[PDB]
Amino acid sequence: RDITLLECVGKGRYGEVWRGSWQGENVAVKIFSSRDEKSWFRETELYNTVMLRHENILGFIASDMTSRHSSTQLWLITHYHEMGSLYDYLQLTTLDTVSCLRIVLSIASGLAHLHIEIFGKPAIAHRDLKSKNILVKKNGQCCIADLGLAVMHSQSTNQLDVGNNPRVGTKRYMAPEVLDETIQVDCFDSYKRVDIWAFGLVLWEVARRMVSNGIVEDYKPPFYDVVPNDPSFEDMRKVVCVDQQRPNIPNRWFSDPTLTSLAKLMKECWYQNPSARLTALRIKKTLTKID
Amino acid sequence: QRTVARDITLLECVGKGRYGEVWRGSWQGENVAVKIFSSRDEKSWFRETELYNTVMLRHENILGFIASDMTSRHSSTQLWLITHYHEMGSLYDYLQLTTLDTVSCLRIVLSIASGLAHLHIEIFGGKPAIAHRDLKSKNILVKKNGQCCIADLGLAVMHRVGTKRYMAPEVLDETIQVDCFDSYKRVDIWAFGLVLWEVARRMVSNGIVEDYKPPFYDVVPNDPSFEDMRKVVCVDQQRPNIPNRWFSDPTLTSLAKLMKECWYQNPSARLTALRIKKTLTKID
Ligand SMILES: COc1cc(-c2cncc(-c3ccc(C4CCN(C)CC4)cc3)c2C)cc(OC)c1OC
Ligand SMILES: COc1cc(-c2cncc(-c3ccc(C4CCN(C)CC4)cc3)c2C)cc(OC)c1OC
Ligand SMILES: COc1cc(-c2cncc(-c3ccc(C4CCN(C)CC4)cc3)c2C)cc(OC)c1OC
Ligand SMILES: COc1cc(-c2cncc(-c3ccc(C4CCN(C)CC4)cc3)c2C)cc(OC)c1OC
């Protein structure tokens, strides 16, 4: 059960993540901020589900809440992915067709796994999908991380579990209905459609790094060109809801059949009408067909 | 950077039920109690963990929290709750063999009242108000200093069903106002009154003591049904017998009055935990 904390690989308002050693193997140890205690508990409820386990979902090892006197620590222990997040990976590396499709199909596979109920594992909507919440594995596939905001639904019992977490999604990735706060809060389909919007943005971030005809774009986050650094909720609402902005499709993509197919797919994630957006299953099937 | 010693040696099993098991364990020399939950009772681990993630209760008469642990296994999730270890065991265990004097009886019941009032009271700045919902002598531990602490917040409510033998009449007749937090406090007070009866029987006066018996031992079977309890408590309106010998002893006379005021059919007539404490501080 003993763990050695070896180096900090991330620190923010969320808390910190450490590379640690456990029985000679690297593990990731997240120490939550007290400010985010409700994410720790939610992530623990989600990882209680044995049938959540999947090659494209960050592997769970343990969760602990420890306390003496008035001090509490909140720990999550997972698999460790040395290559880091997709956000990290894309900064420095360009992609060929095979690697670009492998990445985006693996994320689609993880998301369809979350969204589809197993009769068990409830249907799950993530609510904070972004490139920092995706890890790159040594086999070139990715896995989805951070289930602290997740919503669960059971079709068998008609039960929607939205949890108790005042945390909201990463502002840059928020869907129009999240930014204008018109999202139907008691509708499970609404949360799936928020994930699809964010998936489209991650598809765009990845596709920019795929080389075609000797051309590639630099890594940029969604809406880099239209909002201030460290954008506020209102900054995002302006560009997405008032200005109706969507990420620009570089014209060089239209010379490449793969990037042309991906541009089509990301536009079907970005409809202002949530019910028009593709399902995660349809995205997975479309990416399985694209060459 | 730092070693995080998580190894707990499980040394002996001190409890096995439908809930799972409790073990005496060791962490880094320190004695701990480890409750390993059955799959049947996972929601009790989640509720106690959610409560402690909301408010880190620290009180001499509340079983001391150390850790909640979830570990992924091949094909299951393992759920452990780690607490302080009280080697003298539960009040239920303790009363079977031990008799009490006036000072030890009062110290036991005032320590319980103290833990219960701590749960019940909202503190601003603090803690939400908490009702226990399964108070009984098996959920109270005896400490070496003669005070008790309250255990098991798996059914707690902040502002599984309770043990049937200890259910208040409004729970048995399903009239409890479930939207009203004070209703849950009044259910705990009923159960406290039954625990006070269990303890008072074991207090010696004029060379006499009663044998340990659970509440309603004379009118319901072992593992009484909901119906068995409803008929006794709601339809016939029976209450535990106060033996004549108590009325020769000023302490037991005062405790009989106190437990009567926990057992009113009308929940709003019952004493509060704070008023029980004050009454107990004025006895002897
Ligand atoms: C979970 O339980 C037990 C834990 C420990 C334990 C082990 N290492 C470190 C600590 C610790 C050090 C420092 C801080 C604080 C102090 C300053 N503050 C402003 C912020 C940080 C908190 C915690 C503890 C408490 C020991 C125990 O028993 C001896 C425990 O009980 C079984
Ligand atoms: C998103 O969320 C969670 C992630 C992880 C996690 C797991 N493997 C590896 C990592 C990682 C390692 C290394 C880097 C490098 C990248 C580039 N380099 C310049 C700096 C550092 C980045 C990331 C992480 C962060 C664990 C979590 O919990 C334990 C997470 O929370 C659920
Ligand atoms: C994850 O799991 C378990 C962990 C432990 C445990 C073991 N050593 C040290 C610790 C510790 C406490 C507190 C800090 C502080 C230091 C100061 N800083 C400002 C904040 C952090 C660091 C380390 C813990 C919590 C025990 C366990 O069992 C008794 C665990 O398993 C349930
Ligand atoms: C009620 O609930 C919980 C209780 C405890 C707990 C804590 N200290 C000591 C005990 C204990 C030790 C020893 C004996 C007996 C063994 C044989 N003989 C009769 C002598 C004595 C009984 C009891 C327990 C059971 C821990 C819990 O969680 C970790 C509990 O759940 C919240």
Curated annotation (Swiss-Prot), chain A:
Protein keywords: ATP-binding, Disease variant, Glycoprotein, Kinase, Magnesium, Manganese, Membrane, Metal-binding, Nucleotide-binding, Phosphoprotein, Receptor, Serine/threonine-protein kinase, Signal, Transferase, Transmembrane, Transmembrane helix
EC number: 2.7.11.30
Illness: Fibrodysplasia ossificans progressiva: A rare autosomal dominant connective tissue disorder resulting in skeletal malformations and progressive extraskeletal ossification. Heterotopic ossification begins in childhood and can be induced by trauma or may occur without warning. Bone formation is episodic and progressive, leading to a debilitating ankylosis of all major joints of the axial and appendicular skeleton, rendering movement impossible.
A biological process term (GO) from this entry: endocardial cushion formation
SUBUNIT field: Interacts with FKBP1A. Interacts with FCHO1. Interacts with CLU. Interacts with type II receptors AMHR2 and ACVR2A. Interacts with BMP7. Interacts with GDF2/BMP9. Interacts with BMP6 (when glycosylated); the interaction may induce HAMP expression. Interacts with TSC22D1/TSC-22.
GO cellular component: activin receptor complex; apical part of cell; BMP receptor complex; plasma membrane
Assigned protein family: Belongs to the protein kinase superfamily. TKL Ser/Thr protein kinase family. TGFB receptor subfamily.
UniProt keyword Signal present: yes
GO MF annotation list: activin binding; activin receptor activity, type I; ATP binding; BMP receptor activity; cadherin binding; metal ion binding; peptide hormone binding; protein homodimerization activity
Sites where the protein binds ATP: 9-17, 30
Name recorded for this polypeptide: Activin receptor type-1
Main location: membrane
Catalysed reaction, written as an equation: L-threonyl-[receptor-protein] + ATP = O-phospho-L-threonyl-[receptor-protein] + ADP + H(+); L-seryl-[receptor-protein] + ATP = O-phospho-L-seryl-[receptor-protein] + ADP + H(+)
Role, per record: Bone morphogenetic protein (BMP) type I receptor that is involved in a wide variety of biological processes, including bone, heart, cartilage, nervous, and reproductive system development and regulation. As a type I receptor, forms heterotetrameric receptor complexes with the type II receptors AMHR2, ACVR2A or ACVR2B. Upon binding of ligands such as BMP7 or GDF2/BMP9 to the heteromeric complexes, type II receptors transphosphorylate ACVR1 intracellular domain. In turn, ACVR1 kinase domain is activated and subsequently phosphorylates SMAD1/5/8 proteins that transduce the signal.
Organism of origin: Homo sapiens
First-to-last residue of the parent protein present: 206 to 499 of 509
Compartments in which it is found: Membrane
Segments forming domain Protein kinase: 3-291
Phenotype for residue 120 to R: In FOP; variant phenotype
UniProtKB/Swiss-Prot annotation, chain B:
Enzyme class: transferase
A biological process from GO: branching involved in blood vessel morphogenesis
Residues that, per the record, bind ATP: 14-22, 35
Record-annotated active site: 134
Tissue: Expressed in normal parenchymal cells, endothelial cells, fibroblasts and tumor-derived epithelial cells.
Predominant subcellular localization, coarse grouping: membrane
Cellular localization per UniProt: Membrane
Effect of residue 126 to W: In FOP; variant phenotype
Ranges of residues in domain Protein kinase: 8-284
Reaction equations catalysed: L-threonyl-[receptor-protein] + ATP = O-phospho-L-threonyl-[receptor-protein] + ADP + H(+); L-seryl-[receptor-protein] + ATP = O-phospho-L-seryl-[receptor-protein] + ADP + H(+)
Entry membrane topology: Single-pass type I membrane protein
Protein keywords: ATP-binding, Disease variant, Glycoprotein, Kinase, Magnesium, Manganese, Membrane, Metal-binding, Nucleotide-binding, Phosphoprotein, Receptor, Serine/threonine-protein kinase, Signal, Transferase, Transmembrane, Transmembrane helix
Cytoplasmic topological domain residue ranges: 1-284
EC number: 2.7.11.30
Cofactor: Mg(2+); Mn(2+)
GO cellular component term, pick one: activin receptor complex
GO MF terms, alphabetically ordered: activin binding; activin receptor activity, type I; ATP binding; BMP receptor activity; cadherin binding; metal ion binding; peptide hormone binding; protein homodimerization activity
Family that this chain belongs to: Belongs to the protein kinase superfamily. TKL Ser/Thr protein kinase family. TGFB receptor subfamily.
Assembly and oligomerization: Interacts with FKBP1A. Interacts with FCHO1. Interacts with CLU. Interacts with type II receptors AMHR2 and ACVR2A. Interacts with BMP7. Interacts with GDF2/BMP9. Interacts with BMP6 (when glycosylated); the interaction may induce HAMP expression. Interacts with TSC22D1/TSC-22.
Function: Bone morphogenetic protein (BMP) type I receptor that is involved in a wide variety of biological processes, including bone, heart, cartilage, nervous, and reproductive system development and regulation. As a type I receptor, forms heterotetrameric receptor complexes with the type II receptors AMHR2, ACVR2A or ACVR2B. Upon binding of ligands such as BMP7 or GDF2/BMP9 to the heteromeric complexes, type II receptors transphosphorylate ACVR1 intracellular domain. In turn, ACVR1 kinase domain is activated and subsequently phosphorylates SMAD1/5/8 proteins that transduce the signal.
Recorded disease: Fibrodysplasia ossificans progressiva: A rare autosomal dominant connective tissue disorder resulting in skeletal malformations and progressive extraskeletal ossification. Heterotopic ossification begins in childhood and can be induced by trauma or may occur without warning. Bone formation is episodic and progressive, leading to a debilitating ankylosis of all major joints of the axial and appendicular skeleton, rendering movement impossible.
Protein name as annotated: Activin receptor type-1
The organism of origin for this protein: Homo sapiens (Human)
Phylogenetic lineage: Eukaryota, Metazoa, Chordata, Craniata, Vertebrata
Gene name as annotated: ACVR1
Parent-protein start and end of this portion: 201 to 499 of 509
